[PDB]
Design brief:
The structure holds 2 protein chains of 2 kinds.
Chain A (H helix, E strand, L loop, with lengths): L1 E2 L2
Chain B lengths: L14 E9 L15 H14 L3 E6 L3 H12 L6 E9 L2 E2 L2 E4 L2 E4 H6 L14 E6 L21 E5 L8 E3 L3 E2 H13 L5 H15 L17 E4 L11
Parallel strand pairs in B: 1-2, 1-3, 3-7, 7-8
Antiparallel strand pairs in B: 4-5, 5-6, 8-11, 9-10
Classes of the chains: A mainly beta, B alpha/beta.
Protein name (chain B): Caspase-3
Family (chain B): Belongs to the peptidase C14A family.
Subunit structure (chain B): Heterotetramer that consists of two anti-parallel arranged heterodimers, each one formed by a 17 kDa (p17) and a 12 kDa (p12) subunit. Interacts with BIRC6/bruce.
């Protein structure tokens, strides 16, 4: 899955 | 001898140099930062990619801010005289100018300052590459349908994302930027100058990836990486 940093 | 040109860095020292990879996956419970699923895939991809470019790779996992600083100080104090270059890859949560240790932030300038031309003399005149997979802010790209040298010279910062923007990571394949960087180095390091490799990484990230989210705020978003070069010569990973 995406998700962010 | 004949006519000589000095347009590319000397990359035929006995060693290519160190590649330090700081892989922060798990953060202190105290900080409330989420586990960076996918980052081990990035760290493995980078270790293999840089191994094949003949870098001495050192992987470090889940370092506190104090450990990141101590590591970078210690590495900058090694004798790099026999090394062509230096590479550091940072995989973590971040904000503009900041990378997270497992227990809080470190300014990127604090890390890079150890390698300044005046402070790491055995790297003066050699390329110092910092590859940074971390967010640089909270903007979302919605896309559109289609006799001295400066102490800051000879650094290259390969950022995963534009200033101000989030940077995206997939739990199975790794971050969009590191997947793409490793793919392009594997295909083109024996063929193209590094800025041209990084431009292909820009295109790959920009064109092949788009977020998918059940939350509309974060759905269908795009990313462009950001090459920041203070290099003074062309950089080829190979030599004749």
């Amino acid at each position: 899955x995406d998700x962010x940093x | 001898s004949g006519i000589s040109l000095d347009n590319s860095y000397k990359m035929d020292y006995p060693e290519m140099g160190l590649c330090i990879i700081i892989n922060n996956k798990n953060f202190h419970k105290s900080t409330g930062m989420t586990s960076r699923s996918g980052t081990d895939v990035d760290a493995a991809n980078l270790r293999e990619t840089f191994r094949n470019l003949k870098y001495e790779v050192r992987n470090k996992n889940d370092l506190t801010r104090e450990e990141i600083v101590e590591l970078m100080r210690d590495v900058s104090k090694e004798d790099h005289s026999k090394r062509s270059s230096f590479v550091c890859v940072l995989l973590s949560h971040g904000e503009e100018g900041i990378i997270f240790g497992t227990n809080g932030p470190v300014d990127l300038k604090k890390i890079t300052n150890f390698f300044r031309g005046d402070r790491c003399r055995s790297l003066t005149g050699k390329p110092k590459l910092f590859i940074i997979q971390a967010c640089r802010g909270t903007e979302l790209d919605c896309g559109i349908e289609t006799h001295k040298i400066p102490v800051e010279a000879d650094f290259l910062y390969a950022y995963s994302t534009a200033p101000g923007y989030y940077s995206w990571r997939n739990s199975k394949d790794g971050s969009w930027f590191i997947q793409s960087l490793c793919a392009m180095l594997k295909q083109y390091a024996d063929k193209l100058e590094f800025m041209h490799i990084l431009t292909r990484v820009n295109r790959k990230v920009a064109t092949e990836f788009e977020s998918f989210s059940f939350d509309a705020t974060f759905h269908a978003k795009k990313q462009i990486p950001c090459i920041v070069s203070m290099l003074t010569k062309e950089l080829y990973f190979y030599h004749q």
